[PDB]
Amino acid sequence: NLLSHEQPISFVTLPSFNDHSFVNITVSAAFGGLSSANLVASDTTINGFSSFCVDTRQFTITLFYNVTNSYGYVSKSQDSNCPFTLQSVNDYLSFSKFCVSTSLLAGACTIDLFGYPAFGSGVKLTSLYFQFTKGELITGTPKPLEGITDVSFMTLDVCTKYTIYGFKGEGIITLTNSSILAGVYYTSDSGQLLAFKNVTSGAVYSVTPCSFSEQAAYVNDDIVGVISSLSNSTFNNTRELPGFFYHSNDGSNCTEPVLVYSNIGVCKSGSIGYVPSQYGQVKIAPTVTGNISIPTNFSMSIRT
Amino acid sequence: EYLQLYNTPVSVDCATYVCNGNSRCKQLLTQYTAACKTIESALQLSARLESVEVNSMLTISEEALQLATISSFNGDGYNFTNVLGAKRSVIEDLLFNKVVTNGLGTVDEDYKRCSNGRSVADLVCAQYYSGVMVLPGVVDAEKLHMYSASLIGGMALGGITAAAALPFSYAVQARLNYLALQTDVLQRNQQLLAESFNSAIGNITSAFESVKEAISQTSKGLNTVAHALTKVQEVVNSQGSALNQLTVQLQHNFQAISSSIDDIYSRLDILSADVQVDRLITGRLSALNAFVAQTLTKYTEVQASRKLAQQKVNECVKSQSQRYGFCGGDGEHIFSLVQAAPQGLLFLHTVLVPGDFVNVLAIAGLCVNGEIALTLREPGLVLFTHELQTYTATEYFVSSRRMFEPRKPTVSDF
Amino acid sequence: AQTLTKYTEVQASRKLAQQKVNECVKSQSQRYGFCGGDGEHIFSLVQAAPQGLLFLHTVLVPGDFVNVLAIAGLCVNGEIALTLREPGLVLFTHELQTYTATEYFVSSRRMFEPRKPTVSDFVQIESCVVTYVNLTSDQLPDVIPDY
Amino acid sequence: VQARLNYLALQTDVLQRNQQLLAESFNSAIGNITSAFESVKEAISQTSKGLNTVAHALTKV
Amino acid sequence: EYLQLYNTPVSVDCATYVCNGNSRCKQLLTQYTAACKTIESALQLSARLESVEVNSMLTIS
Amino acid sequence: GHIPEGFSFNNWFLLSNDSTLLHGKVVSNQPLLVNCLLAIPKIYGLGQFFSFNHTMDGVCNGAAVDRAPEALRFNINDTSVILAEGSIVLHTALGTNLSFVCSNSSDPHLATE
Ligand SMILES: *[C@H]1O[C@H](CO)[C@@H](O[C@@H]2O[C@H](CO)[C@@H](O[C@@H]3O[C@H](CO[C@H]4O[C@H](CO)[C@@H](O)[C@H](O)[C@@H]4O)[C@@H](O)[C@H](O[C@H]4O[C@H](CO)[C@@H](O)[C@H](O)[C@@H]4O[C@H]4O[C@H](CO)[C@@H](O)[C@H](O)[C@@H]4O)[C@@H]3O)[C@H](O)[C@H]2NC(C)=O)[C@H](O)[C@H]1NC(C)=O
DSSP: OOOTTTOOEEEEOSSOOOOEEEEEEEEEEEEEOSSSOEEEEEEEEETTBSEEEOOSSEEEEEEEEEEOOTTSOOEEEEEESSSOOHHHHTTTOEEEEEEEESSOOTTOEEEEEEEESSSSSOEEEEEEEEEEEEEEEEEEOSSOOOOSSOOOBOOOSSOEEEEETTEEEEEEEEEESOOOOSOSEEEOTTSOEEEEEOTTTOOEEEEEOSSOOOEEEEETTEEEEEEESOSOOSSSEEEEOSSOEEEESOOSOOSSOSEEETTEEEOTTSOEEEOOOOBOOOOOOOOSSSEEEEEOSEEEEEEO | OEEEOOOOOEEEOHHHHHHTTOHHHHHHHTTSTTTTHHHHHHHHHHHHHHHHHHHHHOOBOHHHHHHHTTSOOOOTTOOTHHHHOOOOOHHHHHHHHTTTTTOOSSSOOOSGGGSSOSSOOOHHHHHHHTTEEEOOOSSOHHHHHHHHHHHHGGGSOOOSSOSSOOOHHHHHHHHHHTTSOOOOOSSTHHHHHHHHHHHHHHHHHHHTTOOGGGOOGGGGSTTSHHHHHHHHHHHHHHTTHHHHHHHHTTSOOTTSSOSOHHHHHTTSOHHHHHHHHHHHHHHHHHHHHHHHHHHHHHHHHHHHHHHHHHHHIIIIISSOOOSTTTTTSSSEEEEEEEEEETTEEEEEEEEEOOSOOOOOEEOOOEEETTTEEEOOSOTTEEEEESOTTSSSOSOOEEEESSSOOOBOOOTTTO | OHHHHHHHHHHHHHHHHHHHIIIIISSOOOSTTTTTSSSEEEEEEEEEETTEEEEEEEEEEESOEEEEEEEOOEEETTTEEEEESOTTEEEEESOTTSSSOSOOEEEESSSOOOBOOOTTSEEEESSOOTTSEEEOTTTHHHHSTTO | OHHHHHTTSOOOOOTTTTTHHHHHHHHHHHHHHHHHTTOOGGGOOGGGGSTTSHHHHHHHO | OOOOOOOOOOOOOHHHHHHTTOHHHHHHHTTSTTTTHHHHHHHHHHHHHHHHHHHTTOOOO | OOOOTTOOOTTOOOOOSSOOOOSSOOOOOOSOSOSOBOOOOTTOOOOOOOOTTSOOOSOOBSOOOOOOOSOOOOOOSSGGGTOSTTSEEEEOTTSOEEEEOOOSSSSTTOOOO
16 A cells, blocks of 8 residues: 555544643753853743643643753753653543653653753753553643544545554544444454444444455466455456455466466466366276276376 | 364464554564564465365266266165255255354355455454455365265266166175175065165264254264264364464563554654564564464374375275274274265265174084095185084085175085 | 474374385285375385485376176076176176177276186075076086086 | 286286386386476476375475 | 373363462453363363263273 | 343443453453342432442332442433433542533533534
């Protein structure tokens, strides 16, 4: 599939309006010294306080650095003891609660923020402690995203990079008229999303991967045809068979298969056909009084 | 007896299984040199070997198959109606319906249904999105039926000028002659044989539709139809086992922060995301190596059944066995029919069991004039008199030891 | 576990190779297809191969068949019924279109190797049966030279 | 080979070269298995790939 | 020649192996759907098949 | 305290804080042992206090069992019944009460469907 730079984003979540608050974090530090660069008077705030906890159903984390290095610039980096990074929290993650503080919260992960004011050993500017719970209601976001009855967006029938009730992947979303009466999402034993509801309307949508697996018939150093779930492919002829499609450059039938499996035969030209059962030589039942036949001129054969 | 001929082959696209089509994960997977080659070619080169073995032992004969399939088979007293069929037989339809109704994967599923999401994907497409394909069964139930009829009709093929089917009371008389040369032929014993077989095939066809409220422990042993139905259902249920355990190992997380690769690459930094995706790659390659080891031993378990099935077709069905118990345990063998069964053949070894024994004085030989000692030439024949209470007697007979077929001695036997 | 299961996988091939040596190479097999599938066996050669044996089972296969009317036995004078002793032999005539014929032969059922019948090939069974040829002691020596 | 033919059927009609059509049919078989041990899959047909033949023996080796 | 007829069967009480009779682990173990069914029945159904296949060939006269 | 065999299960769902099972057998820890089934006609609502430390009151079908619930299941067919201010209040152990309220506005401090 040839959508690498093109592919639409999709986001589906439990029905919401535009209910947004920024968690904006200010990190401040001062530096001095003439024989080396070193740190003084660091402070951290989230929305002007030492701690914050999210209540609105969307949020954006933004970092403001307000570093006053006399040597002209500072490079900045992050360490995560955490299943996210500050810019990745914005990339449609979902939570049941989310609180951030400059001081250690009960279950918390750490993001530690570092500056390098003169290159070599860095210095810790600030530590952010995040307490969160994997869930469905509160979702991270890049910018306040508009809507009245729902905030969700989809593109159907096109390979999309999706977040759907916290599952992520690339896939095709299609509407199905296979209505289901309980829950919000349906998963395989593979842990992979198969379908989900637009719970405001009861409609159920199904998710496929956007590259399917195929068997390529390779003969004489080229792919002469391909066996597939798909109706369309690069070869200029397609044939339909009871379990699958066969794509090739030659729609004829096959009388000289160079590959067989079961009763499916693929010819050198890339034709497909059905190959008949081998016929064994006749053996004669012992019989008493009929018109019988007795084996006469015998050749010799070596079976290896 | 049920003998499995084949195992339903399975194939994997290792990049789809390990990486869910994520490009950055495929780029890491190529660093595990030949891990994919050594999984894929082990499944493909084994699925090919099954295809050439099973399609090469299922040699049909066209001039034998035309004597069974048309139901123009001259049973001449024997009721072959349950065995032949016009498409499958009565026993073949009961045997599939007793097991393939609760079964799966013995009817070939279509992948055309699963590029389009207009219906919510079921188990056999949730596997296909996980990159694992069950191939069409190595031979279809129509080729497997034609083979079975080509063996039943092969018994009526007395000669290649095949204008009508040979009356089966003649093919059974020739099969009795290899046990003992039949002599008292103007007796009811050919009808005793026929009406006994008519009752015996009536009683196998009833067991393919009866229930365990009518089973007793001797009817559950090593060569009877309830043991064959336990063995058929063990095959049909077992075929999912390795393929389910392959698929659930995709929801293990192998110490990574999540069980999905686009989740990890969309939440960690790209340096640390590669480090956690290596534990999913290593774990999922191990889950495939464990599945290839299960799958290759499940082909090897079948191949010793196939080799035995081919021996029973050549020694019990196409010819007749002098080996005492090979075709259906204790008794004198005369023929085995074959029928198609879910992933193999069902053999109906028709063995002669004696209701009665005669007791006779056996005589080693004749010491004529105290001078010339006559002995029978053949160790299969016994020289006897009916008069047990004396060393010499009214009149003498020769018969086989295997069946009581008396005749007067001839100067050519001694 | 992998190494011991591979020794067990090979032992079951070696047990077959010892059977094929003893029943195809050292002797001859009456077991129909054991030595190299459908045909009549005459000998298997053996050659050494990388980790085992390559068996060259030299079978006999018929190019042609002869079609002959088989006779169950002779019902002489309507009184004494003769049947061939051996289930591997067939008594026959080339004259398919008639219930009785010019001259009679015996052969194996497995190869067409004809000979005239001999008085030592036949046994007098207790009763005659409707499938047997109706014949007389005045012409039984047309069937059995040296009767 | 004559003694090994007798176990199948006692031989009789020895006139008109009856052994030479066996011997020359073996020469032309052993001179064909020796070609499959040095030829290549460009000269394979699906009946020449079966359960009792030299291409299956080589695949198994 | 010695030929083995039978393998001494073994059975497992899956909850007792996994949980030692701790009540609150049994509760957790039920969430691994059919994990004990697919261990218990594989051992019991195979122990039963040995019982019939051996006691059916050891026919005394 | 068991639900009778042959009951329809008309709107009783097996609970998940996760994915939903489309078909098949499962063994799970569910609020399916019943202490009482307080049936109210659809033409009445009710106001009661249900305590997770006391036995539920009001006349109820079959035999009443004296246990304090661990779950309360409300089997309301038309969701017009559940949207009003104070329609559910949940009394948390910390002495905080959490009240479900619904509005026709996206701002909660204050039309047919
Ligand atoms: C979806 O995921 C959720 C997450 O909530 C899950 O919730 C879990 O539900 C279970 C019940 O199914 C709750 O489990 C209980 O745990 C308590 C103890 O935990 C306490 O302490 C921790 C502090 O470390 C607190 O955070 C927590 O709130 C609790 O205070 C046990 O007390 C409960 O056991 C009782 O019931 C058991 C049977 O279910 C009995 O075996 C046990 O003895 C207890 O019985 C009591 O009641 C009896 C009534 O007769 C009485 O007779 C006994 O004497 C006794 O009083 C139970 O194990 C667990 O809390 C929830 N998880 C969380 C986050 O709390 C949902 O169930 C889950 N949904 C599904 C279907 O998957």
